[PDB]
Design a protein around this ligand. Sequence first.
Ligand code: BEF
Ligand code: BEF
Ligand code: BEF
Ligand code: BEF
Ligand SMILES: [Mg+2]
Ligand SMILES: [Mg+2]
Ligand SMILES: [Mg+2]
Ligand SMILES: [Mg+2]
Ligand SMILES: [Zn+2]
Ligand SMILES: [Zn+2]
Ligand SMILES: [Zn+2]
Lengths: 514, 513
Amino acid sequence: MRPYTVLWADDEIDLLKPHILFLEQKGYQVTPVLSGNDAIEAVQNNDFDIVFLDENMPGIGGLDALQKIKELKPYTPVVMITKSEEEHIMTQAIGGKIADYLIKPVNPNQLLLSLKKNLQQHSIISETTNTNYRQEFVQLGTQMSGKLSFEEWKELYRRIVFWEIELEQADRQMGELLEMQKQEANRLFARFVTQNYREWIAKPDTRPTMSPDLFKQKVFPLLDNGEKVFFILIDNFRQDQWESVKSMLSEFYTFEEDMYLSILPTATQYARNAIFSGLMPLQIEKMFPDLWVDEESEEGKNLNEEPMIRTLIERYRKHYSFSYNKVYETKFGERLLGQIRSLSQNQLNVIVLNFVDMMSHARTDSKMIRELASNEAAYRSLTKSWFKHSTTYNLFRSIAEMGYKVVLTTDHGTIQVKNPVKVIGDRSTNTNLRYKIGKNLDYNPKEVFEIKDPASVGLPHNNLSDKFIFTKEDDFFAYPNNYNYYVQYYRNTFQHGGISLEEMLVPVITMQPK
Amino acid sequence: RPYTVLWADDEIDLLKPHILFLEQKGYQVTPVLSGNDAIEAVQNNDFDIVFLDENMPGIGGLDALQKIKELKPYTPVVMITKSEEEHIMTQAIGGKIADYLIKPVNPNQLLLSLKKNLQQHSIISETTNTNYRQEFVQLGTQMSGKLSFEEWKELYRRIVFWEIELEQADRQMGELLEMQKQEANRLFARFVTQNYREWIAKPDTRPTMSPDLFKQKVFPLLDNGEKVFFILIDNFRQDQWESVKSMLSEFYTFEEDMYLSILPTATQYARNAIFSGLMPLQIEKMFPDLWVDEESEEGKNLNEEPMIRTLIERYRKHYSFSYNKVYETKFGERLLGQIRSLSQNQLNVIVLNFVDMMSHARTDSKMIRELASNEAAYRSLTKSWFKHSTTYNLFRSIAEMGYKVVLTTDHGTIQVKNPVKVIGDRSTNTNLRYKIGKNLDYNPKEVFEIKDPASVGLPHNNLSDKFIFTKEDDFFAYPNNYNYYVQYYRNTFQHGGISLEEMLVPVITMQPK
Ligand code: BEF
Ligand code: BEF
Ligand code: BEF
Ligand code: BEF
Ligand SMILES: [Mg+2]
Ligand SMILES: [Mg+2]
Ligand SMILES: [Mg+2]
Ligand SMILES: [Mg+2]
Ligand SMILES: [Zn+2]
Ligand SMILES: [Zn+2]
Ligand SMILES: [Zn+2]
């Protein structure tokens, strides 16, 4: 290697000769200077790896030297090594983007620690992530194997996502080894769902929490305990997207993290209507035929969610005051943000955000989103940018100021599809690549989850359709009339409505304002 | 509220003085004696910060760190230990500790660490606010008077720096800077309009511009017998460079500089000028086979590789070189594989294209409006695209080849605000910031007006063909449906006119570490 270079500025550098010898023995080149002006010049005309800085020096002070050095080379770490214990100096150093602040007398090893932490942090963390994943990779495969409970599935998926993000900043083949494990997880999760889905619908008392159960399990207990709640539903928000925005929200909230199961199809007109109605889609139609819109109509499929909310509140003999707001466009979030505090009168404030859904679909037809979200790390990254720079960030921030509980959840996720499944003859479901509705559908029954009795899984259908077929894993339906184009166009896009961990196992977070 | 600290040390009884000190300072400390006790405490509470001994009976502090970061990844952990072994330091760093303090620890060092890890964001805001209020004065005197080109580069670099710094500060301070930026752009437009003709007419005395870029910044390197990668990112302005330079600092050291794009600040003219070494006009007369009239339907920057060849010929050089355009991040994969095969050449040209902001597709329009509503968001998208596209590894891999890299752009872009009325035919171009026209109508005091394109190296078809250019953050708007197109194009990013963002663009000479 080459040695890391250290520029050290102190009016009494002679008193630090022992420390300089120690660092020089550990492979570091130290250039000493005696003033801020000499340190500034050295930084200007050199490319030092790190800068050590005294505060009290004849001439300009370290805090003033720090400002200049940060404008010249803001990416260069600066450590303040001073005898000052004044809080004012600490405060201004932190504010000046100091990397470390060490109070004299300093143990030389404390300087070694700063040098490693501030110059080799990334490679150290990278090597530990690989090492830790190598240790735990086996434990994850076996944890996967066998017959897992629902709660065991939650923790496994939680563990897989964690490694998805950790291994972004680590070795490649560790990352593609995780992809294999994730692939195997989705396969085994698919069997878990198809073997139990009909029973889940049949026996509502022994089933995991699903869309129709969401409000009863996670909202009503809060409201019944006297608490004021903001139910915020970001449509098409996967588990790994929650993990991406989690740290940002931690500045303002504490979390109780949970997950729950979306119903099939993992689509908005079914799962999200089931949430706000508290019922399986078929039960919405029977009990409230005026609020259900069947898949044929050109009318909107989720325009009646507020009335559904009122029937659910009434259906459990609750008297909650509530509001419902639906946000698509950029301007309407700023407007809702402006009128946010007028909602303080209501116990329950429901907010639906549709942009991640829009963006997720734009991964198919928008060259721009094909660039910004080429892979799932970019998609997560792009989700961070949106959350921070849209009005969503300050919306969550204003709610916290209002002393409101927030239940942050979604209706379904989405998955990056890879391999086609042939199909033909459906009705009006060509728009969805993960589920299909119709009669006389030619397909391979081995490749899908067949629902020939839709009313058994709480699904309505008009007389021109009698069955549902769902994809599994990362498959997507493809027609043969324009097959080769169809396949090249939709491969690697994001699609929902089928069976996968990404689509079905989705977050529900109960957040308390700090 | 009081900040809460979880402190796990098997000798917690000897740390009672530190604890009392910290309780006097307003913190609530919870003492525990082992890694398992701490793990359980974190599991059932929301502590703000964790202090962690390493050597304890039971599990080691390092084992506790791994589990606590799993439970509360967003909670800072400070290791406070007597151990001075290097492998312990390294392992704790790997375990994502916030700090590592070797015993005995100054109690003020605990306080500092609590400020730096629990209140650093709000501290940086107040400090940035206070610093800028003071620097606001020097930026006023620095843009006062008549500035030289070198002074315009310093000032523009200064304004960009504070633009990004003030992302983390009070809104009012950003408003205050926004107006200093307005004034800078107003004065910069005067500076350009008063000198642009002189610059084109006197090549030996002008600032470095598009047609001079290769001679000024590339040929000297090669002539000094050093290999070079010339990477041109389309529509990559100064603050986008400032947004990605830290990522690049892990593999390069920088010689940062700027240069002026010619007008229009549009790929068809500026980038062709860079590669041809000539002005867009004299492209056609010097080289008919190379030029493409703007009015031809097929692409205009497809035969740039031959333009580069004639440039090498004109200056009597014999560089072996390559040329590669990467439209999409998928094509970049192939280039990344074959990238080491380009070690044979002295010069390697790569054209990268950042997301098209000219997209009229309804979906792109809806994305753009939400993902890039302001300049902070635009920079954030820029960083995201750079890291997760093939661009990041591309620079990473070129560094391993030990090549010098010249990173630059052909022009920038600006967020437009106010409409400027203009009347023209169906023929007239779509660009919001500049028009070409046989019969253009406009307030000549609202634009930079080039009645004879031929004098400034621009082509034309008719005697009556003009070029007109917007300044500051103006954008052209036609009378038909003027009210609608004003509302649609306002706050969108455009290029082709006169502004610091469009015109004064980065050129970085980078040395692999
Ligand atoms: F003089 Be220094 F601040 F220790
Ligand atoms: F719009 Be939904 F997520 F199908
Ligand atoms: F016992 Be601890 F590591 F100081
Ligand atoms: F023609 Be480029 F988009 F400026
Ligand atoms: Mg001193
Ligand atoms: Mg002084
Ligand atoms: Mg101990
Ligand atoms: Mg032990
Ligand atoms: Zn949805
Ligand atoms: Zn959707
Ligand atoms: Zn361009």
